[PDB]
Design an enzyme around this catalytic site. Structure first.
Site, PDB file in Angstrom:
ATOM      1  CB  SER A  14      49.267  35.528  45.247  1.00 59.37           C
ATOM      2  OG  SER A  14      48.001  35.163  45.774  1.00 59.37           O
ATOM      3  N   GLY A  15      47.946  37.777  43.275  1.00 60.63           N
ATOM      4  CA  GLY A  15      46.745  38.332  42.687  1.00 60.63           C
ATOM      5  C   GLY A  15      46.860  38.285  41.186  1.00 60.63           C
ATOM      6  CB  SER A  19      52.478  33.638  43.257  1.00 62.70           C
ATOM      7  OG  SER A  19      51.147  33.145  43.196  1.00 62.70           O
ATOM      8  CG  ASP A  96      50.416  48.332  48.273  1.00 57.31           C
ATOM      9  OD1 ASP A  96      49.598  48.994  48.940  1.00 57.31           O
ATOM     10  OD2 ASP A  96      50.058  47.217  47.824  1.00 57.31           O
ATOM     11  CG  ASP A 135      46.872  48.689  36.618  1.00 59.52           C
ATOM     12  OD1 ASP A 135      45.814  49.319  36.874  1.00 59.52           O
ATOM     13  OD2 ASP A 135      47.080  47.601  37.197  1.00 59.52           O
TER      14      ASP A 135
END
Ligand SMILES: O=c1c(O)c(-c2cc(O)c(O)c(O)c2)oc2cc(O)cc(O)c12
Length: 274
Positions: A14-15, A19, A96, A135
């Site tokens: 979550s960030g 979530s 990641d 991004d």
């Protein structure tokens, strides 16, 4: 119908991206990731061909989710009174690129080459679909550890690709180009190539080259790890201060450092102990 065509499992993370939970599609036991985003925290909105009000993230994902690979695909979405729930594919096992780099440090150039190449293919696919990610960074790249395939995620700061200037930006500052920092203006492709330059340096050096605005504006690249002259040259080219001095995706992929890339499966067998 209704959102109970899915069995909910643990929370994966979550960030700023919402979530995300591990889940399973009940109809065929397929693994999926379930992203929840609160409506109050969404600034950019768009609309689907049929005219419904949805997050830009949904518009963008739909545009890049036809066909295959490079990008995590949106399988479905739902609207709740205070949020949207996005159903996405869930490769596994996964890590990641931020976490991968945190653990293993600077990557060998052969591995960096395979990874960077796959990122270039994914970004090209996005641009061909009329989508600008805005991004691109290690945190937003998932590695399918078994197949050695990279997948781009988190289109929540993206936009429709256009040929005019962008005067808005809500991606990651340290991956943003000098023209944004100084004039609050950038064009899509050249800004993307700048971010790819930051990413490539990050892969081969284990950390990003710039932390402060002053450093970005200056554009001086210092190498903290041993990196081949061809790789340094490609990085410096991607990080040219003038946007028009940056390479096109074609030029990046025709660069001498990018030749003889490993296939994804080879990459996993040699470097992902798979
Ligand atoms: O599609 C996604 C995804 O699959 C995963 C994921 C998959 C796994 O197998 C894990 O173990 C894990 O931690 C995360 O995270 C995400 C995070 C996002 O912000 C957005 C996404 O689209 C995904």
């Amino acid at each position: 119908p209704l959102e109970s065509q899915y069995q909910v499992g643990p929370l994966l993370g979550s960030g700023g991206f919402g979530s995300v939970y591990s889940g399973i599609r009940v109809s065929d036991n397929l693994p999926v990731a379930i992203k929840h985003v609160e409506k109050d925290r969404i600034s950019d909105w768009g609309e689907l061909p049929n005219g419904t009000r949805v997050p830009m993230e949904v518009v963008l994902l739909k545009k890049v989710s036809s066909g295959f690979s490079g990008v995590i695909r949106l399988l479905d979405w739902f609207e709740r009174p205070d949020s949207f729930v996005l159903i996405l594919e869930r490769p596994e096992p996964v890590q990641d690129l931020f976490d991968f780099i945190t653990e293993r440090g600077a990557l060998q150039e052969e591995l960096a080459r395979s990874f960077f190449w796959q990122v270039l293919e994914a970004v090209r696919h996005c641009h061909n679909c009329g989508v600008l990610h805005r991004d691109i960074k290690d945190e937003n790249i998932l590695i399918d550890l078994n197949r050695g395939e990279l997948k781009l995620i988190d289109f929540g700061s993206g936009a429709l690709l256009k040929d005019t200037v962008y005067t808005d930006f809500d991606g990651t500052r340290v991956y943003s180009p000098p023209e944004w920092i100084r004039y609050h203006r950038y064009h899509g492709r050249s800004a993307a190539v700048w971010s790819l330059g930051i990413l490539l340096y990050d892969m081969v050096c284990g950390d990003i080259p710039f932390e402060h605005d002053e450093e970005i504006i200056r554009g001086q690249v210092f190498f903290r790890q041993r990196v081949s002259s061809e790789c340094q040259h490609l990085i410096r080219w991607c990080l040219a201060l003038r946007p028009s001095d940056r390479p096109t995706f074609e030029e990046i992929q025709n660069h001498p450092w990018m030749q003889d890339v490993l296939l994804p499966q080879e990459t996993a067998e040699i470097h992902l102990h798979s």
